[PDB]
Nucleic acid binder design. Structure first.
Ligand SMILES: Cc1cn([C@H]2C[C@H](O)[C@@H](COP(=O)(O)OP(=O)(O)OP(=O)(O)O)O2)c(=O)[nH]c1=O
Ligand SMILES: [Ca+2]
Ligand SMILES: [Ca+2]
Ligand SMILES: [Ca+2]
Ligand SMILES: [Ca+2]
Ligand SMILES: [Ca+2]
Length: 902
DNA sequence: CGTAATTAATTAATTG
DNA sequence: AATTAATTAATTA
C-alpha cells in the first residue's frame, strides 16, 4: 500500500514522524531534515524556482532547521524577504508525500478516553491534581476494546470490584444497562493502589500509543489532570511518557483570563470532541455537558444517579464505573452519527498538515496552497505583519414588515467561492485598478465598462484572464468535493420523504428493511417494495436515511465552511495571502450581483404581468432573493388548483422554465459587463412557500432584516410529505430563548402560517393559562458568562452590569462559603431566571451553570420566587407581539358588535 | 488567529 | 414607556 504519515513534529533539528509504512505497519523515525528557503536573485541567472509573481529565486539549502530559522531572522535584520515554507514540518510532509495521500483509517489508532476523580472540596483543578484518579476508561479503535482501569483503594474510600454482570442488567433489575453491543468489548482491570493503576496505564499507553486522541473535554480536563497527577506522584519524566517522543509543552494560556494550563503532547494529535462539535456541528447549544449533547444527538436519557458526584464512588461504585464506560461510548456514538473524526482525517490528509490543524482554516489553506505551488516549482511569499482593518461585507435589503402569502426564493450556489472563480481572484492574478463609479451605476448598467482586457470587480480591482490563479484552482477542487457530498445529502433527504409518505399506510407483516444505498434516489423497484413494508421496517429505513443525510451534511457543510474560510482568510492578518483588495473585491461583487439580479427579476416579472414599477423582490440577503408570487397564482386563479401540491408544481415549473432562464441571461450580461473569466453565477430556486390551499394561513411574514418565517412545501428539489417551517433569526432559532418558549412561539408561528388568526388566538389563550406549570429549566433563559470579574464589585453589580452577570453575582452570594456547590465558570453558559421583588436573594435575577439543576440548597427558594409574569412578558409576549404586528394579526381577539348577543 | 451585517435585550442618561 | 449610545449576545449570510 501507499505510505501515509500519522503524526509529525519538529524538535530542535529533528523531525519526529510516526507513519504507516508500505506493509501497513506503524513505524517511527527521527529525521535530520535539511530544509530549503528562497531568496530573490538577478533576472539573468538561470533557475527553476519562481515566486508567485514570476520573479526568479535561488534555493538556500541549510545544514539544519535551526540555521534556516536563524537565516530568516538575519534576512529581517537586513530588510529582505525570506521566501518559502517557514513551517519546516509542512515542507517535510510535502517532500516525503509528494502525491495525493490515500490513508487507511483502520491503521490509525484513535483513542477515546475519560477519567474520574473523586473530590470532596469542589472541582478538581487539573493544574493541581491533588486528588487520586480512581477510574480510566480508554477505548482503542484498533482493538475495538474498552480498557477499564479501576481503583479499589483510595483515601476517599475502599470499594469492591465492578461487576460486568450487574452492569449489563436493566436498570429495572438494579443494573446499569451498559449497552449489550459493548459488554463483550470490555477489558476490566482493577487495582489495589493508584500508583500501580497509573504505571500500568502508562505501559498500556506505550504499547497502544494514541495517534488521534479524543474524548469529551479531554483537552481541558482529562489530559492536564493525568499529566499533572503522574507528574506529582512520579516526577516530570514519567509524565512525559504520554508523548511517544517524551516531549511536552505546558502553557499557562494568555489571551482572555484562564491560567489553568493546557498540555501539548508531541507525537499525538489531540482532537477534543467538544471542540470538533463546536466547530463542525453548526449548532449553538444551551449546554455542552455530555449528558445534554448525548440527549440532543442520540435521544438517550440522562445518566441518572442519587447524591452528588463527589459521593457516587463511595455510595455506588458499580454505577460509578458503569457511567464512566457509557460516557466513553457516547462520544463514539456521537461520532458514528456526525463523523467529525472522518472529516478531520479527510481534511488533514488532503492539506498535508498535522490532523489537529483542521481547527485552523488558515493553516489548512496555507498548506494546500503551498503544496499546489510547490508542484510547479513556485515559491511562496513570506508572511507579513498587518494592522487589523475593517472592510465592507454583504448587502441586505430592508423588507417591508408584512405577511407574504406566496413566496418563491432563489439562491446563488456557493457565492463567494464562485466569485473567486468567476473573477479569478488570487494574490498573483492582480493586474491593476480602474476608476470606480458609485455601486448603483454598475447595478443599473450605466457606468462605463471597467476593462476590455482584464476581469473586474466593482470595487476597482482587475485580474488576469490568461490563466487561473492558485486560489481559484484550489478552491475549485474543494468546491467539487463539496458538491458531490451535497448531492448525497439531498438524495438521502428526498429518500427520507418517500419513506415518510409510505409510513402513512404501513403494511401488516414481519419483514426486514431494504438493503439500499441512501445516497442515491430510490429506483422504481425500491419505491414499489417500500409501499409494501411494515412500520418497523419503514422506521428503521427512515433512521438509516436520516443517518445518511447527517453524514452527507457533515461532509458537505464543512467543505462549504472551508472554502468560505478561504475568502475569510483573505480578510485575516495572519493569512500569508491576506489582502483587503481581494477580500473587498469579493464582497463588493456580491453586493452588485444581488442588486443587479433584483433589478432583472423585477424587470422580467413586470413584463410577464403587464405592470410597471411593481416590486416583486421583497427581500434579499447576501446572495438570495425572495420573490412574491401572489400575482402569479392570481393570474391563473386559486380556484383552478386541485390541492396545495398542484400550485406548488405550478410554481416549481414556473421557476425552472421561466425565471431561471431569465436569471441566467441577466447574470451572463453582468459577466460580460465585468469582463469576467468564467460565468459562474448560478441562481437556482430554493424555497416555495404559501399557506395550505383553502386555509386561512398567512403563508409567511417578515419583521425586518434577518427575521422571517415561511411555510415551505419544497426546498431545492425536496418535496415534503408535511410542510416545513423555515424560520430565520426569530426567537425560536436562538439558543438564548427558553426551550418551552421556543416550542410555544414555534407553534404560534405554525398556526399563523398554516391556520390563521383564530387558531393563533386559541393557542395563545391556552399557553398564557398554563404557563406556570412549566418546569423551571424549560422557562429559563440562557446566556454566555463573559467578564464576570470586570463587573464584580465586592459581590455586587458594578456600573453597566449585564442582566445575566447580575444573576451570576446573585448566585455567588447565595452559595458563598460553600466549597462543593457548582461554581459558574467564566465563559461558560448559564440559565437565567427573574426574581420577584422582596426575595431573599436580594436582587432581580439569579443565574446558575446551564445543563444542570440548581444546587438543592437554594432550589426551593428559586422555584418559590421565580417571576413567571416577567418571564412571560419578556421571553414570549414581547416577541409574539413583534411577529403579529408585522403580520397584521392580533394574538388576542378584539371586541366586536357581535359581543352583544347570546 | 476565516469574514461582515444585523438584530434584540439591556443599562445609563436623557426626553422640559 | 421611548429614544439614544454603548455593551453584550447571538444570529443570517
Ligand atoms: C454561512 C456562511 C456564509 N458566508 C458568506 C459566503 C457565502 O458564499 C455567502 C452566502 O452564504 P450561503 O447562501 O449560506 O452559502 P453559499 O451560497 O456560499 O453556499 P450554498 O448556498 O451553495 O449552500 O455568505 C460566509 O462567509 N461564511 C459563512 O459561514
Ligand atoms: Ca465523569
Ligand atoms: Ca447560496
Ligand atoms: Ca441552491
Ligand atoms: Ca403500504
Ligand atoms: Ca443564501
Amino acid at each position: 500500500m501507499k505510505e501515509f504519515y500519522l503524526t509529525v513534529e519538529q524538535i530542535g533539528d529533528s523531525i519526529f514522524e510516526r507513519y504507516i509504512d508500505s506493509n501497513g505497519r506503524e513505524r517511527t523515525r527521527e529525521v535530520e531534515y535539511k530544509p530549503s528557503l528562497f531568496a530573490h536573485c538577478p533576472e539573468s541567472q538561470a533557475t527553476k524556482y519562481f515566486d508567485i509573481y514570476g520573479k526568479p529565486c535561488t534555493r538556500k539549502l541549510f545544514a539544519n532547521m535551526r540555521d534556516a530559522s536563524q537565516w530568516i531572522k538575519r534576512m529581517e535584520d537586513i530588510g529582505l524577504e525570506a521566501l518559502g515554507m517557514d513551517d519546516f514540518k509542512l515542507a517535510y510532509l510535502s517532500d516525503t508525500y509528494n502525491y495525493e495521500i490515500k490513508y487507511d483509517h483502520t491503521k490509525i489508532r484513535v483513542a477515546n478516553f475519560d477519567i474520574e476523580v473523586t473530590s470532596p472540596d469542589g472541582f478538581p483543578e487539573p493544574s493541581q491534581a491533588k486528588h487520586p484518579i480512581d477510574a480510566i476508561t480508554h477505548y482503542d479503535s484498533i482493538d475495538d476494546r474498552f480498557y477499564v482501569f479501576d481503583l479499589l483503594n483510595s483515601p476517599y474510600g475502599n470499594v469492591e470490584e465492578w461487576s460486568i454482570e450487574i452492569a449489563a442488567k436493566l436498570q429495572e433489575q438494579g443494573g446499569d444497562e451498559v449497552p449489550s453491543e459493548i459488554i463483550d468489548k470490555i477489558i476490566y482491570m482493577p487495582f489495589d493502589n493508584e500508583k500501580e493503576l497509573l504505571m500500568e496505564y502508562l505501559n498500556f499507553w506505550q504499547q497502544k500509543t494514541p495517534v488521534i486522541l479524543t474524548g469529551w473535554n479531554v483537552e481541558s480536563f482529562a489530559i492536564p489532570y493525568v499529566y499533572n497527577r503522574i507528574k506529582n506522584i512520579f516526577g516530570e519524566s514519567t509524565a512525559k511518557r504520554l508523548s511517544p517522543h517524551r516531549k511536552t509543552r505546558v502553557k499557562v494560556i494568555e489571551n482572555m483570563y484562564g491560567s489553568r494550563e493546557i498540555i501539548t503532547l508531541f507525537g499525538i494529535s489531540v482532537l477534543d470532541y467538544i471542540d470538533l462539535y463546536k466547530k463542525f456541528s453548526f449548532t449553538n447549544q444551551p449546554s455542552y455537558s455530555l449528558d445534554y449533547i448525548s440527549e440532543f444527538e442520540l435521544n438517550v436519557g440522562k445518566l441518572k444517579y442519587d447524591g452528588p458526584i463527589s459521593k457516587l464512588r463511595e455510595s455506588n461504585h458499580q454505577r460509578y464505573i458503569s457511567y464512566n464506560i457509557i460516557a466513553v461510548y457516547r462520544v463514539l456514538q456521537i461520532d458514528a452519527k456526525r463523523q467529525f473524526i472522518n472529516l478531520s482525517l479527510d481534511m488533514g490528509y488532503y492539506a498535508k498538515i498535522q490532523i489537529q490543524s483542521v481547527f485552523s482554516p488558515i493553516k489548512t489553506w496555507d498548506a494546500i496552497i503551498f503544496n499546489s505551488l510547490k508542484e510547479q516549482n513556485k515559491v511562496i511569499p513570506q508572511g507579513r505583519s498587518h494592522p487589523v482593518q475593517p472592510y465592507p461585507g454583504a448587502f441586505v435589503k430592508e423588507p417591508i414588515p408584512n405577511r407574504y402569502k406566496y413566496v418563491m426564493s432563489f439562491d446563488l450556489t456557493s457565492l463567494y467561492p464562485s466569485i473567486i472563480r468567476q473573477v479569478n481572484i488570487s494574490p498573483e492574478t492582480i493586474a491593476g485598478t480602474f476608476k470606480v463609479a458609485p455601486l448603483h451605476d454598475y447595478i443599473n448598467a450605466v457606468a462605463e465598462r471597467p476593462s476590455d482586457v482584464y476581469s473586474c470587480s466593482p470595487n476597482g480591482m482587475m485580474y488576469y484572464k490568461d490563466r487561473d490563479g492558485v486560489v481559484p484552482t484550489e478552491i475549485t477542487k474543494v468546491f467539487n468535493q463539496r458538491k458531490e457530498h451535497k448531492g448525497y445529502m439531498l438524495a438521502a433527504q428526498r429518500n427520507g420523504e418517500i419513506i415518510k409518505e409510505a409510513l402513512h399506510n404501513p403494511n401488516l407483516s414481519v419483514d426486514e428493511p431494504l438493503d439500499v444505498d441512501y445516497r442515491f434516489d430510490f429506483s422504481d423497484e425500491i419505491k414499489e417494495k417500500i409501499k409494501k413494508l411494515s412500520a418497523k421496517s419503514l422506521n428503521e429505513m427512515l433512521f438509516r436515511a436520516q443517518r445518511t443525510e447527517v453524514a452527507g451534511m457533515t461532509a458537505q457543510i464543512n467543505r462549504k465552511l472551508l472554502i468560505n474560510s478561504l475568502y475569510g482568510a483573505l480578510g485575516n492578518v495572519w493569512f500569508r495571502y491576506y489582502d483587503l483588495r481581494n477580500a473587498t473585491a469579493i464582497t463588493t461583487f456580491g453586493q452588485m450581483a444581488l442588486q443587479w439580479i433584483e433589478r432583472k427579476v423585477n424587470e422580467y416579472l413586470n413584463e410577464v404581468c403587464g405592470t410597471e414599477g411593481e416590486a416583486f423582490v421583497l427581500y434579499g440577503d447576501t446572495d438570495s432573493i425572495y420573490v412574491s408570487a401572489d400575482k402569479i397564482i392570481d393570474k391563473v386563479g386559486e380556484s383552478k388548483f386541485r390541492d396545495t401540491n398542484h400550485w406548488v408544481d405550478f410554481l416549481d415549473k414556473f421557476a425552472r422554465e421561466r425565471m431561471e432562464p431569465a436569471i441566467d441571461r441577466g447574470f451572463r450580461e453582468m459577466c460580460e459587463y465585468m469582463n469576467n473569466k468564467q460565468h459562474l453565477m448560478f441562481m437556482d430556486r430554493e424555497a416555495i412557500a404559501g399557506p395550505p390551499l383553502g386555509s386561512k394561513g398567512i403563508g409567511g411574514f417578515w419583521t425586518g432584516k434577518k427575521r422571517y418565517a415561511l411555510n415551505v412545501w419544497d426546498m431545492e428539489g425536496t418535496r415534503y410529505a408535511e410542510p416545513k417551517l423555515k424560520i430565520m433569526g426569530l426567537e425560536t432559532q436562538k439558543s438564548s430563548t427558553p426551550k418551552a418558549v421556543q416550542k410555544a412561539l414555534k407553534e404560534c408561528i405554525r398556526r399563523m402560517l398554516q391556520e390563521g388568526e383564530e387558531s393563533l388566538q386559541e393557542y395563545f389563550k391556552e399557553f398564557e393559562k398554563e404557563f406556570r406549570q412549566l418546569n423551571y429549566i424549560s422557562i429559563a433563559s440562557v446566556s454566555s458568562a463573559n467578564n464576570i470579574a470586570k463587573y464584580d464589585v465586592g459581590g455586587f453589580p458594578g456600573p453597566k452590569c449585564p442582566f445575566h452577570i447580575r444573576g451570576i453575582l446573585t448566585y455567588n452570594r447565595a452559595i458563598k462559603g460553600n466549597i462543593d456547590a457548582p461554581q459558574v465558570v467564566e465563559g461558560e453558559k448559564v440559565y437565567v431566571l427573574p426574581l420577584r421583588e422582596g426575595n431573599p436573594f436580594g436582587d432581580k435575577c439569579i443565574a446558575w451553570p446551564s445543563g444542570t439543576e440548581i444546587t438543592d440548597l437554594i432550589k426551593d427558594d428559586v422555584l418559590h420566587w421565580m417571576d413567571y409574569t416577567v418571564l412571560l412578558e419578556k421571553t414570549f409576549i414581547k416577541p409574539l407581539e413583534g411577529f403579529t404586528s408585522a403580520a397584521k394579526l392580533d394574538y388576542e381577539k378584539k371586541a366586536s358588535l357581535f359581543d352583544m348577543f347570546d
